[PDB]
Amino acid sequence: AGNDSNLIWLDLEMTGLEPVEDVILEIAIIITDSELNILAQGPIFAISQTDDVLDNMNPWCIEHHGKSGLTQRCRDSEVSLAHATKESLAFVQEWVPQGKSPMCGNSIGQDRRFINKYMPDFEDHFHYRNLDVSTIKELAKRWKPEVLESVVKTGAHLALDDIKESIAELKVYRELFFKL
Amino acid sequence: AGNDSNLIWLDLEMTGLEPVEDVILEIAIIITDSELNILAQGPIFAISQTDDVLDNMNPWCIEHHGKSGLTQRCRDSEVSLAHATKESLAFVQEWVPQGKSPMCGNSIGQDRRFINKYMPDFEDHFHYRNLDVSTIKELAKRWKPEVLESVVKTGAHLALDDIKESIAELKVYRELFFKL
Ligand SMILES: [Mg+2]
Ligand SMILES: [Mg+2]
């Protein structure tokens, strides 16, 4: 329930990877408890974007985010970045108290960068720490390389599945890589 | 030796934590192999700083970095940021090839932020991933909370010890938290 040591998982899609001139296009939040049971599903926002930014997005993402259906959802969305922030932060505020959960996902150091610039209010609620599953992957690769084979290969259309299968991935690290 | 899957550990001290107006004051690099045996000790640089920045550093760090001896070493250093970059990057280039090792340390997402802005050439050599021991700490705290008690309490005058005791810390996660 909404107390104790629950976790905020999130994933993001951007234009490219340099945040001082690149922008958030999508965000999703998933809250689990400490044992990786999904406890809640936050809002999924496609953030309004200038038609100019979206057409001259850095390519391949042009290819990928046109392919996703995501790009037009930003053309057709009136969700500012503020509103996304305001309701993202409200969402989390009812599942764990300020400053207790880390930011959990895959390669999450790079998401914070954009979170810290564009969604300052949303970041103030997270523990200063990250919990990156991709950090564990590579201890795995260097120590017990065989457990990597029980990770499921792919599939991640929406950001939710990107979150969900990074939660699944941890659970096979939990049972096959950690003492108890 | 200088091949295979060796690791670049580093730690940093800054003025404060907002990089677009805060600056690197110190850097150290330690290379280990994949089993946490220290393989090499890189240069330790105290980066030249304007007397203006250093006096109006964000306080407490004023207290701490005056206390450290670090602050005057920056006043007395002619090491630009470029030189630090140039020889940091040369150092690493002889222990692991470009794009293979992650950036390893404690709460390292926040160091990259400064690395990516101020030392771009040094970052191009790291795997895009971080390996953060502080990520493991909190899986520990949430799953087998008892193993935290074999972590050694503190002591970290220089950046080296900050690196070294984050390498020590992993080794007690290795033996008491991970299957094998
Ligand atoms: Mg992602
Ligand atoms: Mg540090």
Author numbering:
A (entry chain A), B (entry chain A): 2 to 181
Authors' own words:
The crystal structure of unliganded CpsORN contains five antiparallel β-strands and eight α-helices, with a compact α/β fold. The overall structure of CpsORN was similar to other reported exoribonucleases of the DEDD superfamily. CpsORN has a characteristic core sequence, comprising four invariant acidic amino acids (Asp12, Glu14, Asp112, and Asp163). In the structure of unliganded CpsORN, the α2, α7, α8, and α9 helices, along with the β1 and β2 strands form a negatively charged pocket. A magnesium ion, located in the centre of the pocket, tightly interacts with the invariant acidic amino acids of Asp12, Glu14, Asp112, and Asp163 residues. It should be noted that the unliganded and two separated uridine-bound CpsORN structures contain one metal ion and these structures do not have enough space for second metal binding. The crystals of unliganded CpsORN were obtained from 15% (w/v) PEG 3350 and 0.1 M magnesium formate (MCSG I #G10). Matthews coefficient calculations predicted that one molecule is present in the asymmetric unit, with a Matthew coefficient of 2.45 Å3 Da−1 and 49.79% solvent content. The final model had a Rcryst of 23.51% and a Rfree of 29.69%, with a total of 180 amino acid residues and 30 water molecules.
